[PDB]
Amino acid sequence: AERGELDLTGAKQNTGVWLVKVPKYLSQQWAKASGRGEVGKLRIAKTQGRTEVSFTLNEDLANEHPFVLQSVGGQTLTVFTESSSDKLSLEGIVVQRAECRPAASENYMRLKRLQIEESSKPVRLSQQLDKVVT
């Protein structure tokens, strides 16, 4: 028991968690909701020899997100948290990796075009003066 000691109860419990990368719009919508209590529902469909994972955006939030799994054998990922009370703890070990991709093919690029425009909004460039400053 010490300040620098790390709690390993989560690891001893063999806790399994999933690591998922999500786009900005999905995260931005969740940030916009400010954590009202729900942002969507994750649906998992398993067949005789295949597994399908997808996420559905909340209808209220909007006013499909198929999930692609990735092999975890390439790395050992574990989640550790730093509590505000200065008590580090190990949440668990990542057991699956997934990635979120959009459903729209071409119309999505229109959103990106605006996003690139938004990103380039504060990019200042030289201005032309009709008259010489006096």
């Binding site: 000691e5 390993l8 690591l19 900005k24 054998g73 390439g74 730093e82």
Partner: protein, 138 residues
């Protein structure tokens, strides 16, 4: 059976703020880490610079166990986000953003040639003989 056509649906929850920040700890697959042997673990900030803008230092089972040094990920996820899903009895998935990404690399615990002593071995630039015997003297 049901598994051949099993369908599962769970809710997603995004709490506004959490008392404890979430980070990512990564180890090389070839490192062959074993959490079972992790009887004790100590995570403290490194003292090489001499706080939040410095690398981490991980020590397992004190000096006896393997020592790892953590380094914050240089890349910035300005256009990307990382979340962790944790199973809960209620069955509604919870997503927690990762504050930072850290990569931990093991540190060797053995007599290492000192910088002053390495100068002496530099005279034997390529005339070194029986590389094994070098550490025997040390």
């Amino acid at each position: 059976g049901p598994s051949s056509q099993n369908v599962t649906e769970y809710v997603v929850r995004v709490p506004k703020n959490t008392t404890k920040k979430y980070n990512i700890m990564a180890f090389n697959a070839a490192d062959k880490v074993n959490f079972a042997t992790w009887n004790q673990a100590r995570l403290e900030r490194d003292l090489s610079n001499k706080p939040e803008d410095q690398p981490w230092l991980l020590r397992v089972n004190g000096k006896s166990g393997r020592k790892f040094k953590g380094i914050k990920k240089g890349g910035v996820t300005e256009n990307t986000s990382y979340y962790i899903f944790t199973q809960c009895p209620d069955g509604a998935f919870e997503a927690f953003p990762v504050h930072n990404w850290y990569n931990f690399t093991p540190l060797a615990r053995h007599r290492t040639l000192t910088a002053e002593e390495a100068e002496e071995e530099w005279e034997r630039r390529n005339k070194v003989l029986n590389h094994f015997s070098i550490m025997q003297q040390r």
